[model samples]
Target: TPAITLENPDIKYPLRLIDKEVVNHDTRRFRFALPSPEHILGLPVGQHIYLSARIDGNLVIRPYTPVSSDDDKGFVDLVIKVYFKDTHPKFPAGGKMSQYLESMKIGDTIEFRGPNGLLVYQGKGKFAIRPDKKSSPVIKTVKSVGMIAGGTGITPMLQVIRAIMKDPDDHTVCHLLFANQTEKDILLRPELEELRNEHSARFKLWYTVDRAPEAWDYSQGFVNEEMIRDHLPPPEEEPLVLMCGPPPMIQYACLPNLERVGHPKERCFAF
Candidate 1:
């Protein structure tokens, strides 16, 4: 076996960032327009990009999944949750990256790497499951999907939902479950509400917070098996179940139960 020397110049994609208003106290959604045409912007859903921020003399890179549609002509939005801790400093708590991003004026330059993770679906194993008319009749029949997400994990599901809505023939319905620490911490609440109101039949939005305010009540605490069984598509429907969140939450609420309910390993996709 000869040494396989990969030969190609490093092609650097230019950075272009547009500041979006704060969606939440700890989160900012930055809309980035790719310097490419429609033909070139064919990245699959669930893909992410590496954002490079200059920290001290070193460059720090972070991966974020875009929350915009695939057919979105030129721009994609990234919803980022800023984690800050004073007594315990991890990843340079509330430092350069935060400072620069917060202070950034509109139309500032921010370098990035990729349209990486080009695959639409994220999970282990082969993506060859395909749309099987025989084995997976529900894939073709189900008109709606249920999406459950927390924090920045909402990105990929948001993109899918947006894409489905754009196509007239895509009759996929979406029921969204978003949870955060508080109402103020919930990202994209207004936009999601608008979508739910506008596309009543096509969308449903439900939110919950661990620490509730006097103003809110829908579901309290974390999402559990009973809640999932009640809200999500029944086992016979074969509807797609897309979920993203903290590892523990996913492990407890999503992974095992979904498997137990007979959603084939293939039909259940996650980020």
Candidate 2:
């Protein structure tokens, strides 16, 4: 069987700086509007572009996924979070990219190519399924979804969430388990909160911080089995659980517990 390929190159869209909004102390959402409507409508959710720029005299290519939904015309958005650690050579001097991006005003131009990356359509994953009829399998009728994200890992999930929430036809409930070091570190809290409040019946937002705080009362410590078991749909199967976070967190914190209980590997998709 031939697989479907979603790739469009040979078309270069000039990145026109539309707007910039500070999301947090260290993060900003850089808005870039493509030149033509034809150009903007061609991209899909979960797709990222390889942005090119001349830093000093050298050219750099950075791949960033769109945080905006595919339906938005004329423009798309990228949420960049500044990492201040100067430990790695790739980002030897942290905040350079953030500062460079933050300094850009409306009408400035950047170049990007290839809306590259897989377009996710289905939630099916690769775990064993129980065959007994007596066992209550995952309820296929429940439209509720569970998402786990951490730090910048929230980008793709946010895009999907936005797309789903916008569609009147899609009433799928989204339960987001977002973890950050502190309240200040939480990305897109306002938008997430708004969605949670507006779609209270269809959306649930639970958070965890590495350290406890008096101001924000929620889960503490790393996300553990207790947290997942408490919030996620009962194990017999129907709900889809999407996981995206640092590798260690995804591997150690989420995957193991889900497997121990036989959550269909096929049902739990990772990013």
Candidate 3:
């Protein structure tokens, strides 16, 4: 069999689907093989890739942040939440790329183009701040990282988390405030639990759900200022807060709460 090559990030490459695992009823973990045994996805932490395909006589493109670590070789993994038709009244039609991806099986192929985005991780508590053509790039460091995510937004947070946790020297503390509709909707709970168990001193995980089970002990309502103030590192700690999720949650919930608690906009990023 011939390998899929992607030496250039700008060019599209055919990545062969090698495996798929069900993460939940509506989500899956898809793994695609690279060009060769030594090939890598070459994606930076917090960056995303464009997956494009032709559908209904139109070109449909969607960007997805990979869950796989940058050090992962020979393959890449993506955790996708497939949106089905009639799931939302506002959009009766399903997601084009997500539905296409759900229909794909092993041995299938998809085109990918990337290594795109401005948030590039340099090392522990450090990121390269890219600027416009007229401005110069700079490096910024923080003592801690605060992540606020909902639903599939966890993907990018996972990318940043894995990057920090995998490196033994990166001692920067990380705090996560993850919100979802229900406990079952929490993605990567087991992996996050493992990280919390192993790195209790550095990693803090908080969950808030709109609906809870009988035995649920964590937060029950939406994430609020109290949770942000108690869980996230203080602004004086020089922390960077990252938010990703639905527009409403990002705009109304996370941003407002953070601002109310004195987390400056300059130190916050929305993915």
Candidate 4:
């Protein structure tokens, strides 16, 4: 039998939506089938692909990092949070691509483009930076990792986590501080809990919510330096801290807090 390559150099591929699952009120998980059952996405961990559609006579494109692992066969899954204007008062018009995706149904076809992004995980706490660039790629090693994510920003973090935990030889410890507006807003909460329950020795998950019921057991308000000090490995441990969230959270909450605690900027990455 001949082997199948995951990536096709062609600029566009038509993929049919075969399945969909509701993750929450605002998010849905869509599975798009490839040309055949043997076909694979071949996308690297931490990379993203472009989803394009024509809306109102204008081409709309967006980059999305999939929550699915590259090893998944036959189809690729994307967990997307659909932005609706009725829900978000600040953006009365909502997002064009998200609205288009929300209206799509099973058997609907969409155009998908190349696998792109700078961050590439090479396994066992090693990473290659800018693998496609002409400049010499930089390699970095990490013994432990700290991740801060808000809302759908968890997508990229999930990619890295799945890559690490699925490999038995990779013993890198991961500490995650996930922040959301409410308990209901935490995407993939059940899956994250399952991972933590099964891999307690290597994976640690912490939650902080802006609002919660009286029964809530996790941190309240926002992710603070105190939480970082308690959950994250010490700086001497040479831990890599990755931040992914809304611009405000990444700027005011994650980065400043990490930098204040002496985590080197060189070892920090923002997604």
Q: List candidate 4 stretches off by more than 4 Å.
A: 1-10, 131-134
Ranking by TM-score: 4, 3, 2, 1
* lDDT of candidate 4 over 8-55, digit per residue (tens): 635788899999899999999989997788777878788888898899
Error of 3 at 238 (Å): 1.8
50-132, model 1: which lDDT tens digit per residue? Answer: 66776778887777777765556667677887665463456555655655666667778776555554235322211222343
In candidate 3, residue 260 scores what lDDT? Answer: 93
**Candidate 3 least-lDDT 10 residues:** 1-10
The TM-score of predicted model 1 comes to 0.77
- Candidate 2 vs candidate 4: the TM-score winner is 4
Better of 1 and 3 by lDDT: 3
Residue 164 of candidate 4: its Cα lDDT?
A: 93
Whole-model lDDT values for every prediction:
0.65, 0.71, 0.86, 0.85
lDDT of 3 by residue, 58-141 (tens): 899888899985477788899999999888998899888898999998999999988777787777889765654355556789
How many Å off is the CA of 227 in candidate 4? 1.9
Global CA lDDT computed for model 2: 0.71
**Model 3 RMSD vs true structure:** 2.6
Deviation in Å, model 3, residue 249 alpha carbon: 1.1
